Design a protein around this ligand. Structure first.
Ligand SMILES: C=CC1=C(C)[C@@H](Cc2[nH]c(/C=C3N=C(/C=C4/NC(=O)[C@H](C)[C@H]4CC)C(C)=C\3CCC(=O)O)c(CCC(=O)O)c2C)NC1=O
Ligand SMILES: C=CC1=C(C)[C@@H](Cc2[nH]c(/C=C3N=C(/C=C4/NC(=O)[C@H](C)[C@H]4CC)C(C)=C\3CCC(=O)O)c(CCC(=O)O)c2C)NC1=O
Ligand SMILES: C=CC1=C(C)[C@@H](Cc2[nH]c(/C=C3N=C(/C=C4/NC(=O)[C@H](C)[C@H]4CC)C(C)=C\3CCC(=O)O)c(CCC(=O)O)c2C)NC1=O
Ligand SMILES: C=CC1=C(C)[C@@H](Cc2[nH]c(/C=C3N=C(/C=C4\NC(=O)[C@H](C)[C@H]4CC)C(C)=C/3CCC(=O)O)c(CCC(=O)O)c2C)NC1=O
Ligand SMILES: C=CC1=C(C)[C@@H](Cc2[nH]c(/C=C3N=C(/C=C4\NC(=O)[C@H](C)[C@H]4CC)C(C)=C\3CCC(=O)O)c(CCC(=O)O)c2C)NC1=O
Ligand SMILES: C=CC1=C(C)[C@@H](Cc2[nH]c(/C=C3N=C(/C=C4\NC(=O)[C@H](C)[C@H]4CC)C(C)=C\3CCC(=O)O)c(CCC(=O)O)c2C)NC1=O
Ligand SMILES: C=CC1=C(C)[C@@H](Cc2[nH]c(/C=C3N=C(/C=C4\NC(=O)[C@H](C)[C@H]4CC)C(C)=C\3CCC(=O)O)c(CCC(=O)O)c2C)NC1=O
Ligand SMILES: C=CC1=C(C)[C@@H](Cc2[nH]c(/C=C3N=C(/C=C4\NC(=O)[C@H](C)[C@H]4CC)C(C)=C\3CCC(=O)O)c(CCC(=O)O)c2C)NC1=O
Ligand SMILES: C=CC1=C(C)[C@@H](Cc2[nH]c(/C=C3N=C(/C=C4\NC(=O)[C@H](C)[C@H]4CC)C(C)=C\3CCC(=O)O)c(CCC(=O)O)c2C)NC1=O
Ligand SMILES: C=CC1=C(C)[C@@H](Cc2[nH]c(/C=C3N=C(/C=C4\NC(=O)[C@H](C)[C@H]4CC)C(C)=C\3CCC(=O)O)c(CCC(=O)O)c2C)NC1=O
Ligand SMILES: CCC1=C(C)[C@@H](CC2=N/C(=C\c3[nH]c(C[C@@H]4NC(=O)C(C)=C4CC)c(C)c3CCC(=O)O)C(CCC(=O)O)=C2C)NC1=O
Ligand SMILES: CCC1=C(C)[C@@H](CC2=N/C(=C\c3[nH]c(C[C@@H]4NC(=O)C(C)=C4CC)c(C)c3CCC(=O)O)C(CCC(=O)O)=C2C)NC1=O
Ligand SMILES: CCC1=C(C)[C@@H](CC2=N/C(=C\c3[nH]c(C[C@@H]4NC(=O)C(C)=C4CC)c(C)c3CCC(=O)O)C(CCC(=O)O)=C2C)NC1=O
Ligand SMILES: CCC1=C(C)[C@@H](CC2=N/C(=C\c3[nH]c(C[C@@H]4NC(=O)C(C)=C4CC)c(C)c3CCC(=O)O)C(CCC(=O)O)=C2C)NC1=O
Lengths: 176, 164, 164, 164, 176, 164, 176, 176
């Protein structure tokens, strides 16, 4: 559980040195562009219900074998757990986007996720497809691109934060 | 580490909630105050050698009995260790200003100090006397801004209350 | 009653700590944002009659099937209760802006609406059509300033997420 | 998978007891009732194609708005999914008759229908319209025996009670 | 708990006497009409969802002060709890009808309920009104006289079971 | 009291469910078996004096050593108490047949039998030989019908196994 | 937690098919032979006290090394746990015989039994000897060929039931 | 718990009215003077260890019987619990001062305290003396009239906060 500021002091502690002015230049930039970081976290959590619905429904549409008997999203109980997993993964991504660091995502959610899915028989390749759809859905909302829903906001540059969202989603796919 | 961001997120995580207006408003507080705190940390980083030497001398002038044989600080090796321990505390105060909370201080000195100082027989008054001297000597505006010095004295008062 | 202050105190109380520097930074965020949300609270307070009335027909216009015998809103008394329900929700959105958190919404209306609507046969899509219409109809700046609409659409999106 | 046999066995297992006189009297209840219960399972298995088509047709006629754009069923691909889901429900009602309890229904139909139907947003009142019509079209004794019909109405009334 | 058979045994234990012929004949009547008892009970359970909403909405309409601000059924949290515990009362009545004795109703639900309702501030006048509606609904369903819902059942009389249901709901109203 | 009815009601109560068809199927089994059990209870009630009084004699014939001084049954008051216990056990077996389960046996004679007999130095095989002889006289159909004898012998084998 | 009826629908669910005529025809025989099955369970649980005694005592006599010092059945505590374990194994066989399916035996008892016994050092060759004695005792009581004790029942054939008891015990020997 | 803002909406809920202009105005004063309120709490928490030490020092000195044998602060164990209770009370006053309302102080600390102290034998005559000493020292630290500790701060009038903290500690003495 580390934010952007804690990451700076953790690295500098390993050499037992005070946080220098040069290292503080990264933090002053982080604070200056903090309000842009609050444009975006508000955007994802406002549309969390729609994003997970697109991911899971689109994932099944491309792999019709999941709803056939023996598939891992067949009954109602399995379908409800798949939707609940999509929400938890998205919830922890919006934690890292707010904090500015991936520590919260890595240590509380993706720790041991690969082993659990192996024991349960969850398909690993289909879990990647679900998250990759969530990654494209979230990025579209960050840059205010989604065709049906548009959130009124002042013009600006979104490259730094949208790229960060893609990096957090790739960590999930790479771990599982 | 305790901070405005981590405490806010951890409360949301416990209840399984997305970050909402309550959570984003707390982070807005860090943005406003980051200007004042960051000035103090950048000031102490460039002048840590003078603060440590001045604080360390005040400890031994007030308590000359630490020099006598059989006490802590009875030798040259033990004397230089005293200044090294003050440097660590002034380093973590500098970390507590950058982080924005008391994270590093609780995690790295206050966590188990009370047991350690008892085993090695190091009086807690000696460390208290060093910080009291630094806290009272800092003055505005020649040292730092009016608001930056408020944040600095907040960090010194926290460690002092921990040792007694 | 989730809020910036109550969450900060609850986190500090659970650990048995005094209000530290990080805790005061959380309250500092409330002061900066208080003017923005209290502007929307004063606007909604004066137009609860006009907003609720327009949203009521919007819900029934999209779903005319509620007028038939045998389903919700089949009588004059039931249609009157429909508009009273929208006022109740729009009253707590007004309370949420003043408080600064989703406390009033979560404890009073969200509460256990899932079990109640199942028993009384009230479709959750009927309510959403009322809040969706109000959220999209809002425009800047003839209604409120840019920052006020951010907080107002923030509360509307939360109550929609509970119904779907 | 709740049944007469498994409820009795699990009760004795939890207390660490051999199957006793009271345990074997319960299984005699299944033997007496299996005659009528396995007669209704045959008719449903032999006419599931006609029953599903009749029930699904009345579901859409009662709520024609489901055909409208933006609702559940605005395309041919979505409509043929609605009939498939009803065929699933009629299949697990057939299992409930053979097994002798609400086992198959509770695990494969009702376990998470509350979350799934909310997330994909298909109203649950439309499912009730399908099963209510099936329950009312049941005729005795041209369709099945008098005791078989009571068992079949017992399974349908559980499915409807789940969504209400 | 105690059922109809076990109530006879407990009475004969207090005198240390075997179950006599006179008491055994009373049980034989209970068994002979045992098909009616399950035939009664199924009618109550199959309509349990609509019976409760009959009671709670009926109690509110005659006493609008419940949903006024400061009332005990004002918000959604209180309204949901009113439906939840009102259904619990109906659940234990079907246990008493099925078992043939009111001991299960008294021991597991009615024990200490009155003192709890006082602590929470629940009005006793309104609670007994809701229960008395449930008794009227269950009896009408038991005798198969519901206006809009018919169930096919062989012709016969059920005054014995309707009198049984009415007394069980009267025990709840008399306790609180 | 464990029986057919209480086992299913307790199972349904724990899960918080209304009595379903699985529970009503168990009670139906009680109706079929109640005819046979209530004949065995009637036969035992009208002849308990003869069964008990002969059963005690068989116990003392197998173990004459109980007559010796210093043992259980060494005086005339003690020997009467031995017959009185067998009457108690034959009384609870009559209760078991009426109730329909091992309820009355478990909570009134079996629960603390191990500690009481050990403390009072009552050998358990003296009570076993009493029930074995009673179970050996039992013949069909002079005493009771074919099914009543099965129900009666089932209760006697339950009692012996607890003393084994 | 699966009986013979539930096993039929589990096989049918794998192919998403309604319960066919052939399966329903096999189930009708189970109901027809239900009374024969009831009798079997009754005989085992009536003599369960002495079955576990013949097995455990019989296993000791053929392998006297168990009661020798250092053996796994030396003291009273080891002897007591041997009788309890033998009775638990027999307890689940009656559950499987009553339900008509062996899933309850495998899932709740045999799952992990081999791993547990290896850690504790229980000899496997001795354990299967005790069970093989229990299998012979159970078959003798089902077919009513016990030398000392007889139960009066209507004449009939239970080759199907006695053979079924044999297969459940052979599963226990194969598991460990 | 309830802060100053939640107190406004709870009172306005009891009449089911929207938050009025007059009540809104009184809230803006709370927000406008919010810098002083934080400026005040920071003074109390920086001297919490010093404040609680005066109170127990003063309380014992005027009542020398407490430290005598038979007193309620005699051994070290009772002396430590006296300091732990003194800091806990001063801790909750700072919570109420930060929040602006006394709801937190009453519900979590002051509820049932009188019953506990009576059972434990704690003298309530000396307890209120300890609180009254804390009340005097805390007011001095807010108004910066402490004899030995002075903190450089912007000049202004803060008698509004000084009267407020005196009222919170008054509730402590009234409750016990
Ligand atoms: C929790 C509450 C909260 C918010 C919701 C944000 C709201 C917010 N964000 C920015 C900050 C900004 N937002 C943008 C504009 C952008 N162009 C886009 O379409 C993107 C969404 C975004 C880039 C990521 C940029 C680049 C600025 C600064 C420049 C400007 O637009 O004025 C600003 C300052 C200037 C401005 O109004 O834009 C504010 C008030 N911050 C907060 O405190
Ligand atoms: C703080 C929580 C809170 C709420 C959110 C509402 C919730 C609520 N609404 C109604 C009241 C109602 N609401 C409606 C209105 C409707 N007619 C239609 O055509 C629609 C589909 C449907 C909803 C949109 C109907 C039909 C009733 C009557 C149900 C009843 O009286 O039991 C009732 C029943 C009490 C009554 O008014 O008699 C309740 C508890 N009340 C609250 O105080
Ligand atoms: C519902 C529970 C219940 C029972 C099952 C019995 C149990 C029981 N029986 C006796 C009573 C007794 N029982 C006997 C009789 C015997 N002498 C022999 O030759 C034999 C070894 C043995 C019976 C076979 C003796 C000797 C006593 C006197 C005290 C004793 O137990 O030693 C006593 C002691 C006092 C008393 O009479 O209550 C008790 C507790 N009574 C109950 O109320
Ligand atoms: C992050 C947390 C936080 C704090 C710790 C304070 C920090 C703080 N103190 C003051 C400055 C102030 N100093 C005081 C208070 C006092 N009046 C006196 O005569 C005494 C010496 C002193 C008792 C403490 C007043 C009156 C203000 C507020 C300005 C005002 O209302 O006029 C101000 C406003 C102007 C400035 O920046 O200097 C702020 C932000 N508030 C916060 O937001
Ligand atoms: C630490 C963080 C955290 C998570 C990320 C998950 C972790 C997690 N994953 C699963 C396990 C599961 N995850 C899914 C979801 C899926 N269905 C599929 O077929 C897809 C490939 C896959 C993701 C799209 C399902 C349905 C199961 C259970 C497998 C099954 O029931 O067959 C479970 C077991 C419970 C369950 O969901 O059934 C848990 C706890 N929950 C957490 O608290
Ligand atoms: C996490 C940060 C951190 C700390 C806070 C200290 C903690 C610490 N303090 C001492 C221990 C010491 N500290 C001092 C200092 C003093 N000389 C005196 O006369 C007084 C007692 C005191 C005045 C301030 C001395 C002399 C020792 C050495 C004593 C010993 O090791 O026995 C030691 C053991 C030896 C050493 O490494 O110094 C350690 C690990 N070190 C850390 O890494
Ligand atoms: C074994 C468990 C099981 C069930 C009990 C149901 C439950 C269920 N329903 C749907 C979900 C769905 N089922 C439908 C059907 C409908 N569209 C309409 O015209 C109607 C209003 C509605 C039924 C009345 C559609 C179209 C979807 C996908 C959601 C959508 O596209 O809107 C899904 C997801 C799979 C899918 O995408 O189809 C599941 C598992 N189906 C099962 O397999
Ligand atoms: C497994 C569970 C189970 C049930 C649900 C019932 C089902 C049931 N009901 C009756 C049939 C009957 N039960 C009733 C009772 C009633 N007559 C009325 O006027 C009322 C409407 C109704 C109660 C609601 C009567 C009077 C009969 C006729 C014969 C009899 O007395 O049993 C019968 C006997 C004859 C027949 O098969 O029809 C049975 C088995 N019993 C069971 O074994
Ligand atoms: C709830 C308790 C309960 C039971 C325990 C059974 C007891 C039972 N079994 C059978 C029925 C029977 N009993 C057997 C079977 C057997 N005969 C043997 O020689 C074997 C020892 C035994 C099997 C292990 C036979 C041959 C019949 C005749 C019908 C049949 O094949 O089942 C019958 C019908 C009539 C009769 O023959 O007595 C009954 C009531 N049913 C119940 O109601
Ligand atoms: C949040 C609420 C809260 C409080 C306010 C206290 C409540 C409280 N008070 C006492 C109980 C006590 N109260 C005191 C304090 C005093 N006795 C005296 O002689 C003085 C008059 C007075 C100081 C003002 C003491 C000393 C004890 C413990 C008695 C003992 O140690 O034997 C105890 C028992 C535990 C203990 O202290 O040992 C508790 C839980 N603690 C809390 O958590
Ligand atoms: C119903 C599920 C569904 C699909 C769609 C596809 C699945 C799917 N979702 C996509 C596409 C997609 N669809 C939506 C949602 C949709 N778009 C909007 O502009 C808004 C606001 C929407 C709500 C009405 C989003 C947000 C995306 C991601 C953005 C993108 O197109 O890259 C994409 C492209 C990129 C990606 O996300 O992987 C695919 C493959 N199949 C399905 O069965
Ligand atoms: C507007 C708020 C409101 C209500 C709700 C009613 C509540 C109500 N309806 C009743 C009466 C009542 N209601 C039902 C249920 C219902 N009727 C049927 O016959 C069938 C099939 C039903 C399924 C829905 C039954 C079964 C009865 C008993 C008599 C009857 O058969 O109608 C009773 C019971 C009589 C009493 O206790 O005094 C009352 C008061 N009135 C109100 O003020
Ligand atoms: C000398 C020490 C000793 C033993 C004990 C035996 C144990 C034993 N008895 C058996 C099995 C067995 N055990 C009983 C029970 C027993 N017999 C009856 O006639 C009745 C009513 C009984 C009450 C106690 C029966 C009925 C059988 C089945 C008959 C048989 O196969 O021998 C079997 C066959 C199982 C097998 O071989 O796997 C053996 C060998 N072995 C030993 O080392
Ligand atoms: C011998 C046992 C003993 C004590 C010790 C004190 C304890 C004490 N301190 C007080 C309260 C108090 N405490 C302070 C804080 C003071 N200013 C500073 O700058 C610092 C660091 C301070 C610590 C001394 C002030 C300013 C007051 C109010 C003025 C006063 O001292 O009366 C008060 C007055 C409150 C009251 O009476 O209700 C008392 C009794 N007196 C005793 O009887």
């Amino acid at each position: 559980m580390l934010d952007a500021f804690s990451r700076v002091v953790v690295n500098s502690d390993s050499k037992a040195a005070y946080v220098s002015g040069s290292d503080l230049q990264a933090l002053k930039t982080f604070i200056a562009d903090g309000n842009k970081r609050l444009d975006a976290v508000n955007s994802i959590v406002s549309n969390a219900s729609c994003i997970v619905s697109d991911a899971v429904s689109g994932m099944i549409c491309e792999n019709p074998g999941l709803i056939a008997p023996g598939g891992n999203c067949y009954t109602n109980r399995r379908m409800a757990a798949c939707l609940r997993d999509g929400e938890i993964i998205l919830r922890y991504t919006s934690y890292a986007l707010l904090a500015g660091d991936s520590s919260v995502l890595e240590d509380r959610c993706l720790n041991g996720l690969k082993e659990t899915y192996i024991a349960l028989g969850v398909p690993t390749n289909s879990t990647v497809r679900a998250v990759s759809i969530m990654k494209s859905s979230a990025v579209a909302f960050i840059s205010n691109t989604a065709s049906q829903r548009k959130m009124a906001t002042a013009d600006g540059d979104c490259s730094a934060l949208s790229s960060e969202v893609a990096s957090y989603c790739d960590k999930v796919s790479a771990a599982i | 580490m305790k901070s405005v961001i981590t405490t806010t997120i951890s409360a949301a995580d416990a209840a399984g909630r997305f970050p909402s207006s309550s959570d984003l408003e707390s982070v807005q507080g860090n943005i406003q105050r980051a200007a004042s705190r960051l000035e103090a940390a950048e000031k102490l980083a460039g002048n840590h050698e003078a603060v440590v030497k001045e604080a360390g001398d005040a400890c031994f002038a007030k308590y000359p009995y630490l020099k006598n044989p059989g006490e802590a600080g009875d030798s040259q090796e033990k004397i230089n260790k005293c200044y090294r321990d003050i440097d660590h505390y002034m380093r973590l105060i500098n970390y507590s200003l950058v982080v924005g909370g008391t994270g590093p201080l609780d995690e790295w000195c206050i966590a188990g100090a009370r047991e350690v100082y008892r085993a090695l027989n190091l009086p807690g008054s000696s460390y208290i006397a060093a910080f009291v001297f630094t806290r009272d000597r800092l003055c505005v505006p020649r040292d730092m801004s009016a608001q930056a010095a408020v944040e600095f004295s907040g960090a010194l008062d926290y460690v002092i209350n921990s040792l007694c």
